């Protein structure tokens, strides 16, 4: 169509970091949306649908209490202020210690009135736990409505 | 501009032990005819709507009992006030360190005008509404 759109996927080759990518196969960055500084830049004022998923994986439970967050934040052109739009927290481990693998996905989605030149960041707290190897697990998208 | 009916209402942080949706906030919407009435979103015209809601539950230590958490979006028909489940999940909280359970619901539904939508949970005493963007409820016409 002609609608501003993106669906970016985590770079599988990055190392313990969340790095958004516009790959050819089943990814999108079109109709004026740009990926600058791992951040989607809104090309025009209006309503957008904004969404993201991360999947965290761990081989067992460490001593310290583990808290996982995923967040979509808006950075305003006007001031460079950074407000949380969508977030969630997950408690993967309640005990410690063989070592069985654990998995915790987080999905965020909603509708926001945005200004041209606003940037959106999709950010986590434990990239050492991020399962970005396989595809379809880590992604970040907008589409103008 | 856009003239598509749209809402994105957020849990009142100053409310206490209940889920109260608010629209008169930054990074919230209620426009093109959608009303917030008796804690529920009112559909201003017939058609396809995308409906979504997220809640975050939190406790200071694994419950002493087998708690189940649920989140539901329900359709109340204009007449007959019939309440049907559109979207729902149930989460098992962890079987003192803090625990966190998000639930996300969304999908597309044909609605008649004056149909109401409620987004409701079962344990408001575990609902984490103090923080921004953890608890929301929206629709948009497609």
């Amino acid at each position: 169509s002609d609608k501003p759109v993106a669906h970016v996927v985590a770079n599988p080759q990055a190392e313990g970091q969340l790095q958004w990518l516009n790959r050819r196969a089943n990814a999108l960055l079109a109709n004026g949306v740009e990926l600058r500084d791992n951040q989607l830049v809104v090309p025009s004022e209006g309503l957008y649908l904004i969404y993201s998923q991360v999947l965290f994986k761990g081989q067992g439970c460490p001593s310290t209490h583990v808290l996982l967050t995923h967040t979509i934040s808006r950075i305003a052109v006007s001031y460079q202020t950074k407000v949380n739009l969508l977030s969630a927290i997950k408690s993967p481990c309640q005990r410690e210690t063989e070592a069985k693998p654990w998995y915790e996905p987080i999905y965020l989605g909603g509708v926001f009135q945005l200004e041209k030149g606003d940037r959106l960041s999709a950010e986590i707290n434990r990239p050492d736990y991020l399962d970005f190897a396989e595809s379809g697990q880590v992604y970040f998208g907008i589409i103008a409505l | 501009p856009s003239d598509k009916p749209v809402a994105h209402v957020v849990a009142n942080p100053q409310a206490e032990g209940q889920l109260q949706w608010l629209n008169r906030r930054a990074n919230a919407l209620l426009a093109n005819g959608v009303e917030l009435r008796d804690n529920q979103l009112v559909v201003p015209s017939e058609g396809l709507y995308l409906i979504y809601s997220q809640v975050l539950f939190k406790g200071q230590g694994c419950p002493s009992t087998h708690v189940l958490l649920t989140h539901t979006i329900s359709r109340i028909a204009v007449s007959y006030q019939t309440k049907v489940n559109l979207l729902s999940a149930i989460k098992s909280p962890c079987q003192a360190k803090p625990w966190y359970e998000p639930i996300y619901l969304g999908g597309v539904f044909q609605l008649e005008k004056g149909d109401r939508l409620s987004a409701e949970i079962n344990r408001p005493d575990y609902l984490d509404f103090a923080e921004s963007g953890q608890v929301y409820f929206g629709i948009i016409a497609l």
């Epitope: 808290l67 967050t69 949380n84 | -």
Partner: nanobody, 115 residues
Framework: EVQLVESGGGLVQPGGSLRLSCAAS????????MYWVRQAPGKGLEWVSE????????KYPDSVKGRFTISRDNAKNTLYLQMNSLRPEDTAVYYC????????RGQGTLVTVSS
């Protein structure tokens, strides 16, 4: 009516420790990512810490990494910077801000590190 008031600034010796404090008011503290920035004499403004709304995401430039810890209390509308293994290269006016360019910073607080 946004106001950020920094405090905890003072004179400390190298290898020393300081806790800076920041009182927020006039905005919803819980909504905004917060920042520590500093300015040494004859130097540009330099961001030293970024923290998200829940305090689980922290970022630091390599200049202060290992040594500085940013934290927040949303109930207290207060932001903190725990500064450890302090160096003479850390002496400056330290501000809290809603951007890394120093947006809505206050009088700042002065941290002097000498013998």
């Amino acid at each position: 009516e946004v106001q950020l008031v920094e405090s905890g600034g003072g004179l400390v010796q190298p290898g020393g420790s300081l806790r800076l404090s920041c009182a927020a008011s006039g905005f919803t503290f819980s909504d905004y990512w917060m920042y520590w920035v500093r300015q040494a004499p004859g130097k540009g403004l330099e961001w030293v810490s970024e923290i998200n709304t829940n305090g689980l995401i922290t970022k630091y430039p390599d200049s202060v990494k290992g040594r500085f810890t940013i934290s927040r209390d949303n109930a207290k509308n207060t932001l903190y910077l725990q500064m450890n293994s302090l160096r003479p290269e850390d002496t400056a006016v330290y501000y809290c801000a809603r951007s890394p360019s120093g947006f809505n910073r206050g009088q700042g607080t002065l941290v002097t590190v000498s013998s």
